[PDB]
Design a protein around this ligand. Structure first.
Ligand SMILES: Nc1nc2c(ncn2[C@@H]2O[C@H](COP(=O)(O)OP(=O)(O)NP(=O)(O)O)[C@@H](O)[C@H]2O)c(=O)[nH]1
Ligand SMILES: [Mg+2]
Ligand SMILES: [Mg+2]
Lengths: 176, 164
């Protein structure tokens, strides 16, 4: 059983908590069920491997913090979440990614770009723009709805696969 | 231990009373931590396993241990609405006004979630009605924001019976 340490980040209100709770509890949290920053564990099979996902669901924020730095150092991979009806949240992605790279001092941190709230009747962020950004970062882009559950498993599982590739690319380094 | 520590964490989260007892008898580290800083007491508290909470507290668990996002067991029990766990934590030295990374105290968490009895018990143990979170909000303010009017009145009366 391999453990994967996953962190969910992004602007306030984009659905980080809703995405996590859907994964863990198969429950959609609406406006009336207040959430906290918290950690979760899920056992799943991914590509034949039994995995333990240790997930930290963090708040959107714009603060320097020693504790937040610490969880970024500990985390192995990051879901960087925006909402497809919030242009600002999409513009903020750059800052989340930059902060993780700075704190972990690495150009190759496992990450997935997540465009959430794809159930909504409309949108303000163009899919192609998000795809272009993910491509320029060399990372997967996944569209999700915490409400319908579309893409929820995909987002977390894809992040696991990105961690696995990173670890495998490091072991090639570590002998050669 | 680390082997025994990992087993203790999983037994505590899963509510396995007998397995917790046996692990502790074998010298499992009662304050073992998982990846994101949870101790067995955190995991028992947040999943509502009262008997394990009690056993842990009696066998040396740090009642004010703080996880990766600044939650103590009391925060988590207050959030999740486990009254009896809140009570035993407070009776065994829990810091009633512990602060998470959002600036929330247990009282804020109980007030947002509408747990009336837990609000009254926290108040009894000296919870701060004037504590402000990172957004400037007091528990009263959060009770209003979440449409918890009974809790707002209780909080408002507490603030007065304290002003005098
Ligand atoms: N329609 C829809 N609403 C969603 C979806 N995901 C989240 N929401 C809603 O968006 C609001 C905020 O969601 P939440 O999960 O708390 O966001 P967050 O990113 O965790 N916020 P914070 O950074 O403060 O912790 C809630 O009212 C929630 O129900 C989604 O996929 N679809
Ligand atoms: Mg959240
Ligand atoms: Mg965890």
């Amino acid at each position: 059983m391999t453990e994967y340490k996953l962190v969910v980040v992004g602007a306030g209100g984009v659905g980080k908590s809703a995405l996590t709770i859907q994964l863990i509890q198969n429950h959609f949290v609406d406006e009336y069920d207040p959430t906290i920053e918290d950690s979760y564990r899920k056992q799943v099979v991914i590509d034949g491997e039994t995995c333990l996902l240790d997930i930290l669901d963090t708040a959107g924020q714009e603060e320097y913090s020693a504790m937040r730095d610490q969880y970024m150092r500990t985390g192995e991979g990051f879901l960087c979440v925006f909402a497809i009806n919030n242009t600002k949240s999409f513009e903020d992605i750059h800052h989340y990614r930059e902060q993780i790279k700075r704190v972990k001092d690495s150009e190759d941190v496992p990450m997935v770009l997540v465009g959430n709230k794809c159930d909504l009747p409309s949108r303000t962020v163009d899919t192609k723009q998000a795809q272009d950004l993910a491509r320029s970062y060399g990372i997967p882009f996944i569209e999700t709805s915490a409400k319908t559950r579309q893409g929820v498993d995909d987002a977390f599982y894809t992040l696991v696969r990105e961690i696995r590739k990173h670890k495998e690319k490091m072991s090639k380094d570590g002998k050669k | 231990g680390s082997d025994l520590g990992k087993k203790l964490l999983e037994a505590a989260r899963a509510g396995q009373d007998d397995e917790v007892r046996i692990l502790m008898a074998n010298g499992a580290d009662v304050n073992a931590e998982d990846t994101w800083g949870s101790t067995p007491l955190h995991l028992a508290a947040k999943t509502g396993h009262l008997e394990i909470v009690e056993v842990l507290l009696k066998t040396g668990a740090d009642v004010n241990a703080s996880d990766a996002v600044g939650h103590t067991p009391l925060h988590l029990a207050a959030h999740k609405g486990h009254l009896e766990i809140v009570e035993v934590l407070l009776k065994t030295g829990a810091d009633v006004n512990a602060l998470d990374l959002m600036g929330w105290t247990p009282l804020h968490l109980a007030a947002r979630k509408g747990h009336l009895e837990i609000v009254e018990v926290l108040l009894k143990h000296g919870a701060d009605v004037n504590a402000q979170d990172k957004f400037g909000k007091t528990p009263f303010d959060l009770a209003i924001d979440n449409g918890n009017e009974d809790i707002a009145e209780v909080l408002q009366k507490a603030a007065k019976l304290n002003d005098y």
